[PDB]
């Protein structure tokens, strides 16, 4: 079945929910790669959110200004990011990192129910819109190899 989607949703969903609640979900997981990918995401996503916090905070404030479910507003933005024809791992980590930043805001305003749809909407953009690119790059295995030199 759609294993690339299933795996991507698992990694993104775990990262977003643990960043929101501050707790690591003790649940077993393409096992080894998903652990290596969530780990790479924890290190990389941490740095992105800190370094570009002012840009992230500014973007979020422009979504709140229109009283609406922040996830619906964000999904509408993410679907225009690759419209220049360029795809890379940096843009991909940034989308997930911004999703994690938004997931924390959702946890602050007591809207953690809309976190699952957020991870799913991001996964829909990455997998169902960039499947051909992800497959050529070896999926999440190309993700871990790009961010870590050996």
């Amino acid at each position: 079945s759609d294993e690339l989607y299933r795996q991507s949703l698992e990694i993104i969903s775990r990262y977003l929910r643990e960043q929101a609640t501050g707790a690591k979900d003790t649940k077993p997981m393409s096992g080894a790669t998903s652990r290596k990918a969530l780990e790479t995401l924890r290190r990389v996503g941490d740095g992105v959110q800190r370094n570009h916090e002012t840009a992230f905070q500014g973007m979020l404030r422009k979504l709140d200004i229109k009283n609406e479910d922040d996830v619906k507003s964000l999904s509408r933005v993410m679907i225009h990011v690759f419209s220049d024809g360029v795809t890379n791992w940096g843009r991909i980590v940034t989308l997930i990192s911004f999703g994690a930043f938004v997931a924390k805001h959702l946890k602050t305003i007591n809207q953690e129910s809309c976190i699952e749809p957020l991870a799913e909407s991001i996964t829909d953009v990455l997998v169902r819109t960039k499947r051909d690119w992800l497959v050529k790059q070896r999926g999440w295995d190309g993700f871990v190899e790009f961010f870590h030199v050996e």
Binding site: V44, H52, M78, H80, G90, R91, I92, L95, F146
Partner: protein, 123 residues
Amino acid sequence: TEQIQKRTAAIQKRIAAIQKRIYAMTASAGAGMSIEEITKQIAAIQLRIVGDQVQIAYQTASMSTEEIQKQIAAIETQICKIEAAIELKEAGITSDFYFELINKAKTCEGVEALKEHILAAHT
């Protein structure tokens, strides 16, 4: 070149100036270029800038300089299109044809020439 940061910084100031101009416009009209779409396009360009900064950072000791220039130029052309769309709306343009003509431009100069043509001949 050292001027990659200045063009990127200039893009940020232009985006800020566009947001202020929209906020004022609403307070007392195209295809794919309404107030709603422009806000989303702006937010998307900002995510794209951060994304490419992270790409450059990890690519080293893991997008050539040519590709960076192309991507900056593409972002500038899109900003140039957004600005021309707001100007057309303020000058009375309501037909989607003119907004779509602008969106077909390849450079900021093409945008400028088209926008000048529409204001001079189709207002």
